Design a protein around this motif. Structure first.
Motif, short mmCIF file in Angstrom:
data_model
loop_
_atom_site.label_atom_id
_atom_site.label_comp_id
_atom_site.label_asym_id
_atom_site.label_seq_id
_atom_site.Cartn_x
_atom_site.Cartn_y
_atom_site.Cartn_z
N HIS A 176 0.84 -1.21 0.00
CA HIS A 176 0.00 0.00 0.00
C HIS A 176 0.87 1.26 0.00
O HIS A 176 1.06 1.88 1.05
N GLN A 208 -8.68 -2.15 2.80
CA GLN A 208 -7.42 -1.37 3.04
C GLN A 208 -7.60 -0.41 4.22
O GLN A 208 -6.69 0.36 4.55
N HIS A 209 -8.77 -0.43 4.84
CA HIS A 209 -9.01 0.45 5.95
C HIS A 209 -10.15 -0.10 6.80
O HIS A 209 -11.23 -0.39 6.29
N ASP A 228 0.49 2.71 3.90
CA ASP A 228 -0.38 3.58 3.14
C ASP A 228 0.37 4.91 3.05
O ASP A 228 -0.14 5.96 3.39
N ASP A 265 -9.07 3.12 -5.56
CA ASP A 265 -8.51 3.99 -4.48
C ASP A 265 -9.26 5.30 -4.16
O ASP A 265 -8.73 6.38 -4.38
N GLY A 266 -10.48 5.18 -3.61
CA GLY A 266 -11.27 6.35 -3.20
C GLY A 266 -11.33 7.44 -4.28
O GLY A 266 -10.50 8.35 -4.28
N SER A 267 -12.30 7.37 -5.19
CA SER A 267 -13.11 6.18 -5.36
C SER A 267 -14.13 6.40 -6.47
O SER A 267 -13.96 5.89 -7.58
N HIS A 271 1.69 5.09 -2.07
CA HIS A 271 1.49 6.12 -3.09
C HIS A 271 2.82 6.81 -3.42
O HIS A 271 3.35 7.54 -2.58
N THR A 331 -7.85 -1.70 -8.11
CA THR A 331 -8.47 -0.87 -7.10
C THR A 331 -8.76 0.49 -7.72
O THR A 331 -8.00 0.96 -8.56
N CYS A 366 -10.50 3.31 1.77
CA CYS A 366 -9.46 4.38 1.79
C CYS A 366 -9.75 5.39 2.91
O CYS A 366 -9.97 6.59 2.64
#
Ligand SMILES: [Zn+2]
Length: 364
Positions: A62, A205-206, A256, A154-156, A64, A152, A182
């Motif tokens: 995870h 992931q959260h 993350d 990823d929010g979203s 970025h 994914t 997220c």
């Protein structure tokens, strides 16, 4: 042409093999050749790991890296430096880049940069829908070829539940996990139910509440392929998480890593170990389980043959002193960013060497 290496006098822990002991490790040609007491061979460099802990390279699923698009907040090179200083030899980057990772051109860019920088293994993820826009299903077949290990958005704004469902069908045929989040409990239960239905693997992931954990636990005992993660930096009820870790419902640690340069959150890669070692100094987890949750567990989730010291494996090795005190500041901070409450505080536990493919890629 001179490339045998011996790691001597350390305390080796490898949960995947259930190996723990004062062993030596012989590395030949980028691969693990032998684990055994008392090793000496001609034509090899010796690393003296007396008083240190030797285990498989950490894997963080995870991260970025902000590349391409936001390379002033962070980029592949800085991220990579951060990761190896942190004991990580493989990292999985999210696809909220600009442009997003929804075509072979960006995948191809991230791999090439990655090979040039040379330090750690960067595995890309693809988005669930084109341009992460939410309407259309991307080409999971071609993106898996190109190197993507998961999908994914990823929010979203997913939240159309038919999309999420197509994705897990496709993912299931392809043997790769979908990564989500997220309202949290509703989402997590939906995901569980769609996962059970399609037999696809979903990875959450959260998770922030006792009820979320109990739901995941429920679907796990039903044999739903569902895993989840927690950021060790977060951890110092915000208290069921700690229990969730104790009881092994949370599968792995992941930082993350989220660089910013002024919800949002925090950079992570460099402090994950000294953070997680707080949980061991409190008897909350053993050291073997801590290493488990940085190594074999995340390896199993993304289905790569890493996080072990099996004879024949790639020589990905982290060597760390769990009692060494240091401070994250301009002096030590290898991120382009400094967004972390841990800034300037005293950490305990530091990586001394990181070795990838038999080659030393970080040294303290
Ligand atoms: Zn993320």
């Amino acid at each position: 042409w001179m490339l045998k290496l011996i790691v001597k006098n350390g305390y080796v822990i490898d949960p995947s093999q259930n190996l723990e002991g004062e062993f030596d490790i012989l590395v030949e040609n980028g691969k693990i050749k032998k684990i055994d007491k008392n090793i000496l061979v001609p034509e090899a460099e010796i690393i003296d790991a007396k008083g240190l802990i030797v285990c498989p390279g950490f894997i963080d699923i995870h991260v970025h890296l902000r590349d391409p698009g936001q390379t002033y907040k962070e980029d592949i090179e800085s991220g990579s430096r951060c990761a190896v200083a942190g004991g990580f030899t493989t990292i999985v980057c999210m696809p909220n880049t600009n442009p997003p990772i929804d075509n072979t051109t960006v995948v191809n860019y991230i791999l090439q940069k990655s090979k040039s920088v040379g330090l750690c293994r960067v595995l890309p993820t693809g988005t669930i829908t084109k341009g992460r826009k939410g309407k259309e299903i991307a080409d999971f077949y071609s993106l898996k070829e190109a190197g993507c290990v998961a999908f994914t958005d990823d929010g979203s704004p997913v939240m159309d539940s038919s999309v999420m469902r197509k994705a897990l069908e496709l993912a299931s045929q392809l043997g790769v996990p979908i990564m989500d989040h997220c309202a949290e409990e509703i989402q997590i239960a939906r995901d569980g139910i769609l996962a059970q239905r399609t037999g696809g693997h979903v990875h959450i992931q959260h998770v922030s509440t006792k009820l979320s954990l109990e739901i995941i636990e429920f679907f796990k005992e039903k044999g739903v392929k569902i895993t989840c993660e927690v950021n060790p930096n977060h951890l110092l009820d915000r208290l069921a998480l700690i229990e969730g870790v104790k009881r092994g419902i949370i599968d792995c640690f992941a930082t993350d890593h989220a660089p910013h340069q002024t919800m949002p959150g925090i950079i992570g890669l460099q402090t994950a170990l000294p953070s997680a070692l707080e949980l061991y100094r409190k008897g909350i987890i053993s050291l073997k389980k801590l290493i488990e949750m940085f190594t074999i567990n995340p390896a199993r989730i993304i289905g790569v043959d890493l996080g072990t010291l099996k004879l024949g494996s790639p020589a990905d090795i982290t060597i760390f002193d769990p009692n060494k005190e240091w401070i994250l500041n301009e002096e030590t901070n290898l991120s382009k960013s400094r967004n972390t409450p841990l800034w300037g505080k005293v950490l305990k536990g530091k990586v001394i060497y990181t070795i990838k493919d038999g080659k030393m890629v970080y040294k303290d």
